[PDB]
Amino acid sequence: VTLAGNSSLCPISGWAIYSKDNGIRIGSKGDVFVIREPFISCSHLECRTFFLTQGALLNDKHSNGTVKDRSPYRTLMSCPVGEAPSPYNSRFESVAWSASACHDGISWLTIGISGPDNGAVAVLKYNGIITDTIKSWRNNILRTQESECACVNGSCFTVMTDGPSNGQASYKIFKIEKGKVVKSVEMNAPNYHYEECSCYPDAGDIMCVCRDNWHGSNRPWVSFNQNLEYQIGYICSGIFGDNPRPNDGTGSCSPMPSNGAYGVKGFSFKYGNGVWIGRTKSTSSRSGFEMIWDPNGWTETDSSFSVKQDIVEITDWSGYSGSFVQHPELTGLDCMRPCFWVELIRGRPKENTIWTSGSSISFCGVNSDTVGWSWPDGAELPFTIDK
Amino acid sequence: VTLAGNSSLCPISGWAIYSKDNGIRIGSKGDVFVIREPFISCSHLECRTFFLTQGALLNDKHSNGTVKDRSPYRTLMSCPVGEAPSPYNSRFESVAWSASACHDGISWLTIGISGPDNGAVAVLKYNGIITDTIKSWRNNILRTQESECACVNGSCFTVMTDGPSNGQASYKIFKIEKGKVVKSVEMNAPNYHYEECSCYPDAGDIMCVCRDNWHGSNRPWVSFNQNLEYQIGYICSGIFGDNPRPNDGTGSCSPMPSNGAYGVKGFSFKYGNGVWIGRTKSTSSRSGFEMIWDPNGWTETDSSFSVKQDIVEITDWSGYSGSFVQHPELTGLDCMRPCFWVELIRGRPKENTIWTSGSSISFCGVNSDTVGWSWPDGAELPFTIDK
Amino acid sequence: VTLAGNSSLCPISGWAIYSKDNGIRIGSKGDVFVIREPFISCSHLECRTFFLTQGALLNDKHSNGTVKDRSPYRTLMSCPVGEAPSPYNSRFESVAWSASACHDGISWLTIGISGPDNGAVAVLKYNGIITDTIKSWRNNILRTQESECACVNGSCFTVMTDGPSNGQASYKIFKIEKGKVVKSVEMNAPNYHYEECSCYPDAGDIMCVCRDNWHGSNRPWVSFNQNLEYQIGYICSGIFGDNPRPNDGTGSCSPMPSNGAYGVKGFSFKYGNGVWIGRTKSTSSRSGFEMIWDPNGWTETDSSFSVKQDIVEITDWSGYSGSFVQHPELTGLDCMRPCFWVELIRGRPKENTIWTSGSSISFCGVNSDTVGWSWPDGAELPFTIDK
Amino acid sequence: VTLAGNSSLCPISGWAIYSKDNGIRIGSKGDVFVIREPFISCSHLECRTFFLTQGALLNDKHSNGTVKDRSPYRTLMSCPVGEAPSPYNSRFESVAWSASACHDGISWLTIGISGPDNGAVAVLKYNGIITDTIKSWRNNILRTQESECACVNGSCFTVMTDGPSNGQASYKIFKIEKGKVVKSVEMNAPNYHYEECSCYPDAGDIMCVCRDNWHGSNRPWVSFNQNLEYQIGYICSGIFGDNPRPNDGTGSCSPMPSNGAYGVKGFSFKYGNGVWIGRTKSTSSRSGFEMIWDPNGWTETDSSFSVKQDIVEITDWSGYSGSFVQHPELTGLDCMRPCFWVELIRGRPKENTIWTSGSSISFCGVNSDTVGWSWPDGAELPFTIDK
C-alpha cells in the first residue's frame, strides 16, 4: 500500500548522528567512484544513498577534471546508506547530469536530465521502465532538485527551473502518479529565484526551501496542496542562511541584496512560527556547519536565537545539504521524523589537485539528550596521481 | 506463466536513452573483463546484459591478442544492465565462442557453440541444466545470432548458419520448447546470404533482419509463423544499411552488388510499409550512428526520408548493433515496445594497442519528446600495458 | 517469536574449532579494513561478526597510527562469520568508538558511543531506526561491553561504566525492550572495578565476568535476575585469570593486589562450583592461550586443576576474548551451548610497523572427542608501506 | 523432502562440456585465492564448487610454498559453479586440510579434518551447526575422500583411512543421519589399499572407486547397501587406470604390481559388465586426459576397447579428477545423470615458480552428438612475484 503522509512533524530538541561512510579515506587504495551531489531517500523498508558519477575511479588518470559538469558520461546510481560507493556494490539508476528520486510505497521513481544545453530532456522511470519525458520549454539549461522528491497519498511532487542563473527565470511544479505527469502549473513570481529546492511533506501539504542565486542572501520558500495552489515568500529571520552572506543583523521578507549573488543548496524546517536553520560557519567560503533554533524566525526580523549545535568545525570543508523524512509506515511512530545530510567537498578549486569529490554524513532528530562535536572528512591530500 | 506475445509494436516517434556502463574508463584501474559482442535481453521481471569474454582482465598481460576469436577460453556470462562487467558481479552461463539466449517467462534458455572448426557442437541449457545438443551438418564454422532469440507462447526460435562466408551456405530455422528441439527446416534461398540475424516477434509471427557478407550492401530479411513457413527478400529502400556501402541512390530488392563484400551486424523495424533504419554515419569505416525513418522504405526504391536522429558523432568509433523488445507482462502496456543497443569498439586494428574491447549503450522508443546528441565511449588510449 | 532463554548450559568436555578468517594474510594484497575488538553474535538463523574500523584499509598511508582510539572516523560494521572484512561484503551498523549488539529473536539491536570525552552519547538502534539515547552521567570516558549483550524473553541487558580507569568509578545495569530503556539501577560496589563485561544467560538469569583495571589480577563477576537484583564478588580460585598476574598460588575472593593494576578483557563459565577459565600463557605479555577446568574454582582457593587444552602457543600473539551462546531455537537441542572467540593482535607496540590490527578464531564446546593444537595468525611482517 | 535415490544411471554415449572458470588467467591481476583439490556437488536447486585454500592470494608474497600441506591456515570454502574463487564471492564452510560435503535434500553437510598428525579430529557440521566429531583411531594421518559424499533416502555415506601410506592401513565406512554418526564398520581387506574414494549411488546402493598407493597400478572398488554389507575387488580390465602405470597389456583382478607404488585420485562408472575409464594420456607424468569405453572391462582381462574421447592434449598439465551426479529431483528426468570434473595444476614441482594452484573443468554425460577437443588451462608462467 501507499504512504499516507497525513501526519505532522513531531517535536525535537536535538540531532543524533546516523551515518558516515568515509569515502575518500577508503578510496585512497580501494576502488571508489568519483561522486558529487549525494542524497538519501527512504522507502517503507530501507534507506539508500543516491549520487552522480562521471565514470571515473578515484586516484586514476581519468579523474582529470577537464570534463565539463554537463558531460555525456555522468550517471545516477545508488548504494545502501553508510557504504563507500564502489562499482562492486552499486545499482544503476539512470543517465543524467541532474536528478532526483522518491519512493511512493510501491516502487522507486527516478528523474534524470541529459542532453545539450538548449535541448535537455528529462526521462522518468518507474520501477526501471521508462514511462514519460519532459523537454525544456525556454531553451536554457533544465535543472531539478538534486534531492528527494515528496510523495503524499501515491502522488509525488517536484519543482523544475529553466532560464538564466543570474536573472529572471521560469518555474514549474509537477504532479506525478505512477511515472506519468498528471498536472503542472508555472509559478508567477517576479523578483524571485528558485534553484535546487528541498521539499518535505507536512500535514498533507508540501513545503520547499530553495536557493536564490540572483540577488539573495536569505532563502525563499513555496508551499502548495495536492491541487497545486501555491504561496511564496522569503524567510523573515535575521539569521541569514545562504553563503556568501553579510553579518547577522536586521533581516527582511523581501529579497536581501547584500552579498546576494551565488549561494549553496540548503534546507530548513518550520514549526509554527519558529524555524531550524542549517548553515555554514564561515560567511565567505564553505567551511563548517551548525544548527540554529530561532523561536520566532519564520515571521520576525530580529537576530536573536535560543539553541546552537555544532556539526563541523570552522577549519574544515563542507558543501551542499538537504532534508529527508522517515514515514510512520517505516519507523512505527505516529509522526513524521525529520532528518538531514551534509556533503564534504575535497579537491579543486580550494586545493591543489586535479580532481574533486565528496563524502557524506547524516543526522536524525530526536527528543532525548544529544551532544555537539565535529565529524570532518579526514583525508590527507594530495594523492599519488597528483604528484 | 508464459509470455503470450500476440500483440503488435506500438507507435513511436523517437528514442530515449536507457543505459550506459562506462566499461573501459572504469577498467583502466579496476578489474573489468575484456569482452566483445554484448547484448541485452529481458525477462518478465528484469533485464540483463550478456557478453563473451576470453578469460582476461583489462590492462593485463594475458589481454595480448595473439589469441584466435575461436579459442578454448571464451565463455558466456551476464551482469545486470548498466554495470561494468567484472568477475565479482557476473554470473556464469556457458562455454562458447558464439551464443544467444532468451527467456520464455519461466526460465532462461542459453545456446553456446564450442569445438573445432569442422566439428563444432552447440549445447542447449534450460535453467542451468544441459538438455540437448546440435552438431554441425556441413563441417565448416557453425555460427548463430549473437543476440536474443524470440519467444512466442512458450516456444523460442533461432537461426543458424554453416558454410563459407564468401559464397553459398546452408541455413536452418529451429523451434525449441523447454530446451528440446522440436522442429527444424532448412531455407531454400539461392543467391542469398544470412549471418547474425536479429529477430523480434510481432503479431504472433517472427521477423529477422540479417547481414549479407557475400555480395550485398543492403540487408536481407526472413519472416515465418509458428509452423515454420517462411518468406524471403531484401529491403527495397534506397537508404543502404550495411557497411561498407555505396552512396545513397536508387535502391533494389535483390542483392545490391556495389561494395558488398563485408559488413556489420545490424537491425531494422517494420511499420506497415515504412521502416526504421539504424546505420553508421561513415560509408567505409565503423564511425558514428544514426536512426532514419523512411515512410515507404520496405517496398519502394526512392532515397527520400523524413526524420533523422543522431546517436554518435562521425569522429567516434562504433560497431555491432541489434534489437530487443519488452513484453506487456513486464511493462504493463498493451504494446510490444521496441528497443536497441550499440557496441563501441576500442583498440586494434584501428588503434595502436595490443588488445581490443567494447562497451555498450542502449535506447528505448517512446512517443513523447526526445533529443539528439552524442554519447561516445570516452576512454583515453593507450593504456599502461601498451607502453 | 522471541528467544525464551529459560534453559541451562549443557555439559561439555572440550572445545572444537569453529571459524578462522585469515584477515591479515589476505589483506597483504586485497582490500581489507583495519579493525580491532571483533566479536560474534548469533540470531535464530545465522551468526555474524562485528568489528570497529577507523576508515582505513590495510597497507595504505591512511593506516598510519597517529589517529587516537576515540576518533571521529571509527564505525561499527558486520560481515558473515569466517570472512575477511572488506568494504565489498560488509554492512554498516552505527558510528561509534565503543559498542555492543544482540538479537532478541525479531530484530538486531546495536549500541554505539561517540562524542567528546566529557559528553559522550550512546545511540540505540533497533532494526536500523534510532530509538533512544543515553548521555554520560559523570563527564568522563563512557564505555560499554565490546561484546554481545544478553537477551531473555524479549528483554536485553547490558552494563556500562563511567569514571576513572585507575580508581573508583560508577556502574549501571540497563534493561532494554524494543530499543527503549525501561529500567536501570546503579551498582553499589566499594573497592570493585568493572570494565568490558562479557555476559551470558543461564536458567533465566544473567551472569557477567569483567576486567579489574585498578588493583586486581583476578576477575570480578555480577549476576542478576530480570528485575535487576544483583550479587557481587570475585572468582575465588587460585588460578589467576587476568594479565599481568603473579604466579599461581593461594587465591582470594576479594581483590588480589599483586600485579593488579591493568588487565585484558576475558571470560569464564560457571558449572555448579567448577569453572572454565580462559587465559593467556605468558604472565607479563599477551602471548598464547589455554583453557583450564578447576572443579572447585568458583568458591575454593587452592590451585589444582584437572584438564588443560592448548589454543595458541606461547611464542605467538593474542589479545581480547569473550563469550557467546547458541540458543535452542537455532541449534535444535534442549540446552544453551557455550562458545568463545579470541583476537590476535599484530603491529605496534610490540612490533616495528606504523599500524595495528587483529584477526579472530572461535571455538564451540562439545561432548565428544577433541584435540589441542596451535592456530596462530601467520602473517609475515613488516608490510610494504612500512619500508 | 529428501532425495530418494532409488534410480539407475541412464545410458549415455558421450560427454558434453559444462563449466570452465579460468582461475589463474584472471588471478594474474585480480584477487583470487590459491586453491587445490576442487570438487563439485549439487543440491536439489543448484550446484556449487568447494575447494581448500591456505589463506593466500595469487601473486602475493604469502603464496610462497614453504607452508606444509597440513598447516593451521587452510580452510574449506565454496562459490557458485563456473566462477573464479575470490574473497568477495565465496562462503566459509569449515577449517580443514582434508574434507568432503554432500546435500541430503534439506541442508548441507560438511566434514573437515584439522589438528596434529597423531591426533587429527574431524568436525561434522549440519546446516552450519557443529553436531559431532570423530577422532583418529590409529594415531597416524587421518584422511577422507576429497570429493562429494553420497546420500540415499536421508542417509549419507563416506569412507575414511588412517595408517601408513606405503603399507597396510585401517579402513572404515560411516553412515550419517542429520549430522550424527549412526553406524560404522571397518573393512577387512588384507593386501588392499584405499585412498581418496569417489562414490556415487546407483539403484539404492553405493559404489566407490579409490586409489591404491602401495603396490597397485589399477584401481580398487567397494560396494555396500544401506546396512553396510560390503564387497571388495579390483577392476579386471587391461586398460590400466592409475598413474604411473605400465603399458597396456593383460590385466588382472588382484593388485597389479608393476609401477604400482603411487597414484592419483580418479573415478569410473559401471554399466553391467562395461566400464567408463578416465585416465591421463601420459604413463609417467600428469599430462592429458581421455575417456575410454570397454564393453567388458569390469570382469575381463583383455585390452581392447570401443570408443575414446579426448579432453586435454598430452602436452598440457592435468591432475585429480572425480565424479558427481544430478538427482531426478533436480534435473526432472527419470535417471541418475553422471558427470565428472578435472583439476589442472600449474606451478611447482614441474615448473619454476614459488607457488602451486589449480583450476577446473567439468563435463556431463548425454545421449546426443558430441565432439572431442582440448580445453587446457592457458596461463603464461612465470608471474611477477617470481621474478
Ligand SMILES: *[C@@H]1O[C@H](CO)[C@@H](O)[C@H](O)[C@H]1NC(C)=O
Ligand atoms: C492519517 O491517515 C491514517 C491512515 O489513513 C490514519 O490512520 C490516521 O489516524 C490519520 N490521522 C492523522 C494522524 O492525521
Ligand SMILES: *[C@@H]1O[C@H](CO)[C@@H](O)[C@H](O)[C@H]1NC(C)=O
Ligand atoms: C590533465 O590534463 C591536462 C591537459 O588537459 C594535462 O596536461 C595534465 O597532464 C593532465 N594530468 C594528468 C595526470 O593526466
Ligand SMILES: *[C@@H]1O[C@H](CO)[C@@H](O)[C@H](O)[C@H]1NC(C)=O
Ligand atoms: C487518497 O487516496 C485515496 C485513493 O485514491 C482517495 O480515495 C482519497 O480521496 C485520497 N485523499 C485522501 C487524502 O484521503
Ligand SMILES: *[C@@H]1O[C@H](CO)[C@@H](O)[C@H](O)[C@H]1NC(C)=O
Ligand atoms: C492476446 O491474447 C490474450 C488472451 O486472450 C488477450 O487477452 C490479449 O488481449 C490478446 N492481445 C491482442 C492485442 O491480440
Ligand SMILES: *[C@@H]1O[C@H](CO)[C@@H](O)[C@H](O)[C@H]1NC(C)=O
Ligand atoms: C604480445 O605478444 C607478442 C607475440 O608473442 C609478444 O612479442 C609481445 O611481447 C607481447 N606483448 C606483451 C605486452 O606481452
Ligand SMILES: *[C@@H]1O[C@H](CO)[C@@H](O)[C@H](O)[C@H]1NC(C)=O
Ligand atoms: C498457446 O499455447 C498453448 C499450449 O499449446 C495452447 O493451448 C494455446 O491454445 C496457445 N494459444 C494460441 C492462441 O495459440
Ligand SMILES: *[C@@H]1O[C@H](CO)[C@@H](O)[C@H](O)[C@H]1NC(C)=O
Ligand atoms: C522453557 O519455557 C518453555 C515455555 O516458554 C517450556 O516449554 C520449556 O519446557 C522450558 N524449558 C526449560 C528447560 O525450562
Ligand SMILES: *[C@@H]1O[C@H](CO)[C@@H](O)[C@H](O)[C@H]1NC(C)=O
Ligand atoms: C606517519 O606519521 C608520522 C607523524 O605525522 C609521520 O612523521 C610519518 O612520516 C608517517 N609515516 C608515513 C608512512 O606516512
Ligand SMILES: *[C@@H]1O[C@H](CO)[C@@H](O)[C@H](O)[C@H]1NC(C)=O
Ligand atoms: C515472557 O514474557 C511475556 C510478555 O511478553 C509474558 O507474558 C510471559 O509470561 C513471560 N514468560 C515468563 C515465563 O516469564
Ligand SMILES: *[C@@H]1O[C@H](CO)[C@@H](O)[C@H](O)[C@H]1NC(C)=O
Ligand atoms: C523410486 O521410489 C519412488 C517412491 O519413493 C517411486 O515413486 C519411484 O517410481 C521409484 N523409482 C524407481 C525408478 O524405482
Ligand SMILES: *[C@@H]1O[C@H](CO)[C@@H](O)[C@H](O)[C@H]1NC(C)=O
Ligand atoms: C620463499 O621462501 C624462501 C625460504 O624462506 C625464501 O628464501 C625466499 O626468499 C622466499 N621468496 C619470496 C618471494 O619471499
Ligand SMILES: *[C@@H]1O[C@H](CO)[C@@H](O)[C@H](O)[C@H]1NC(C)=O
Ligand atoms: C525411506 O526412508 C523412510 C524413513 O526411514 C522410510 O519410511 C521409507 O520406508 C524408506 N523407503 C524405502 C523404500 O526404503
Ligand SMILES: [Ca+2]
Ligand atoms: Ca544568494
Ligand SMILES: [Ca+2]
Ligand atoms: Ca528571533
Ligand SMILES: [Ca+2]
Ligand atoms: Ca555487405
Ligand SMILES: [Ca+2]
Ligand atoms: Ca523513401
